[PDB]
Each structure stands twice: as C-alpha cells, then as structure tokens.
C-alpha cells in the first residue's frame, strides 16, 4: 500500500519545515531509493530529489533530504511563497512493479496567523427526503491556512461512499472556505443513530453531529 | 527531454477515450514509462507501467479496460480507455523514469524526471439541468439554501431580492462525481427575526432558464 505523509504542514517564511514519509521498510529489506516530487496547483509534478538527499537539477540548496530507515524526510529552508505546493514521496527498489507513493503533503507558507475553522452541519431537509434523497451539508469557513481534511462517520464508523468535498478557496476576508456533502438514501439516514462531519485543521479537529429528528 | 500529451475529454459511463503521450529528446520505446492519474483535489495514483522492453503492467482496477500501446512512428505511447467508469475521472499524466539496472539488478534509481502536463478526462452523465433548491432550516441563527444537482455553472444566489446582504455566505460549488454541481448559501440572522422576517433565497440558473425563490422557514 501507501507511504504515510502528513496531509499538511505549514511554516513561516524564512523558517524551515520538514515533510516526513513513513513506511519505507514495510515491504522488504532491499535498499530503498527515495524520491520527492513537487506539484504546484494546476501544474504537473516535478522531480525534486532522489536517493533521499541528492538534489535534482535546479533544486536549490534549500531542499535537503535525510532518512531514518523507515522515515525519509524532506527539509525546505528559507521558506518562501514559491514553496507552496503538494509534495509526494516515492520509494522504489529492485522487484517493485510500481514505486510506492505517499499520499501527498500540502505545504502552506503562513502569510497570516492560523485561524481555526467554523463548522456548520445541516441535516437532510424533509422536502428533500420527500424526493427520496438525503444530503448532509457540512460548511467550513474562516480557516487559515487553506488545508483541511474532512471525514464523515455513521454512528461511529467511517463512511467513504457518497462524500463530495471541495478544495478550499480563498474568501474575501483572506481566510478559506470549503464544503463537504454526504449523499445518502433516506433509509440510510433514518436507520442510523447519528451522522458526523469531522474537520481536521493543523492537527486539531472540530466535529458536528446530527440525528434524524 | 520532454513529454507532451493530447486527447482525453468527456465521455459517458461505458464509453471510450484515448490519451496520447509523445517524447522529444529520447525514444519512448527504449525507456521505462508510466501512466498516472489524479482525481481532483486528491493524490497521484498509478495506472500502468511500460518497461524498456515493452511489457505493460496495469493496476488491478483498470486491467481489462485500459490498454497501453506503442506508436513508434510518432515516438509515442497511447492510453486506450474503454468501458469508462465514474471512478476514472481525473487528470492523466505520462512520465519517464530514469534507472540504471544490469539484467534485473538495479544499480541506481533516479525517479520520474520527465512528466507530461496532464490531460483532463471527465466521465459524466450530465447535461444542462436546473437545480433542485432545498431549505436549510435555521442570539443569531444560520439558515440557508441547498442548490443541488445543476449543470453547467454558474448559479447566482441572493436573499430577499438583494435587500439582505449582511451575513450572507455563498460557498463555492462542488463538482460531484455525477458531473453535476451543488452549492449552498447560508445567512446569519438575528434569532428574534425568525418567524417575523421572511427569508427567501433567489436562485437563478440561466443555462437552464430556471429561477427559484425558496422561502426558508424555521422548523
């Protein structure tokens, strides 16, 4: 399966940040070649770094890698606005068919103080239920930086099907907004005790719960 | 060394599309090549691998539906996509991987150093469609309008024909896997105004000549 990366890291301009990549030795003892890729929004990925710490082409001295056997690290110093991007680690060894990919880290360069999200969760309306449909609406606003993870639960177990979540987009007040929708059948809605929208942001979580009523 | 792409596009479930991947500076047919895809706002996932000898490996979820072939006169490879599903929507990339291997003994590995810019693939059963508008029932209270399942963009939303603007937040739409859009608009009002001040969201979707005024009432 996949390597483990934080969904997001953030750092202040001038400072340094480290993106970690764990699980490198979950599949054998063969030497692992670790590569890092940078992808700006709307653009294709770019190879940054190979063999943990060997910089690729015109990757500045600011990008360095280290490694702890099971966790490889990419450290970016003198952080600046161009560094805002998604970063993917990859591990290849002899015998792999595909390199293993990490899930990606969104890197944010803080140009203002962090702001926690406000979260509003609406249950399905009886009008929509009458149309044999059910939509849970989770509205997320006023956060910074613009990176959130949204998870849904039915009672206490995670739900993945029927979830549609926007990419965060800048509000007029310079913080961000996002929406997540959980589509259910009316039978699914009524047959559970509650549904929950969980919003993770800079390692903190807000959870809102609704119940058929 | 450059890769360039073309093709892709829009198709109903079950249809077919093709993505091309050509090289300059090197020949596809002597290099290790990869296809990847990325669902919007998500991460990279593998699609197919072609080694320098031309054997192709597929991820399980596309085997039997997708096939990769060499087009040597165009110094290219082609991703033929048949029996398309909703899950196949995304931006598709081809890439070249640099490695040093004698026999099956890898000596060095650089990674995917050359990438195409990506080709958009959209699997959708969507055509022009007006939205269904549902009320989101409400110190202060938050009430709103859910504007569900419309196509194409955009819809506009106002409240009380524009007499109510303070406290309004209309959220960017979500593009669903169906290919349809949905958005919500929510307004924050004094709770003492509920059941004495009427709240109506005015939704307009000019591509389908649909206008909806929904009264949003307290439960």
Author numbering:
A (entry chain L): 2 to 9, 11 to 27, 27A, 27B, 27C, 28 to 95, 95A, 95B, ...
B (entry chain H): 2 to 82, 82A, 82B, 82C, 83 to 100, 100A, 100B, 100C, ...
Task: Quote the study's own text.
Using single-B-cell RT-PCR, we recovered four bNAbs, M1214_N1, M1214_N2, a clonal variant M1214_N2.2, and M1214_N3, and one non-neutralizing mAb, M1214_b4. Competition ELISA performed on CH505 SOSIP indicated a different epitope for bNAb M1214_N1, which was effectively competed by both CD4-Ig and CD4bs-directed bNAbs such as VRC01, VRC-PG04, N6, and N49P7. For M4008_N1 and M1214_N1, the BCR repertoire identified clonally related γ and corresponding light-chain transcripts, but not μ transcripts, as expected. Surprisingly, the BCR repertoire also identified clonally related α transcripts, indicating that these bNAb lineages class-switched to both IgG and IgA, a phenomenon unknown for HIV-1 bNAbs before. Because the PCR primers used for the donor BCR next-generation sequencing (NGS) did not distinguish among IgG and IgA subclasses, we could only infer that, for the probe-identified M4008_N1 IgG2 lineage, its secondary class-switching from variant N1.3 IgG to N1.3 IgA would be IgA2, and for the probe-identified M1214_N1 IgG1 lineage, its secondary class-switching from variant N1.2 IgG to N1.2 IgA could be IgA1 or IgA2. To assess the physiological relevance of the IgA bNAb members and help rule out possible sequencing or PCR artifacts, we purified the IgA fraction from M1214 plasma and found that the M1214 plasma IgA indeed neutralized the same four HIV-1 Env strains as did the M1214_N1.2 IgA1 bNAb.
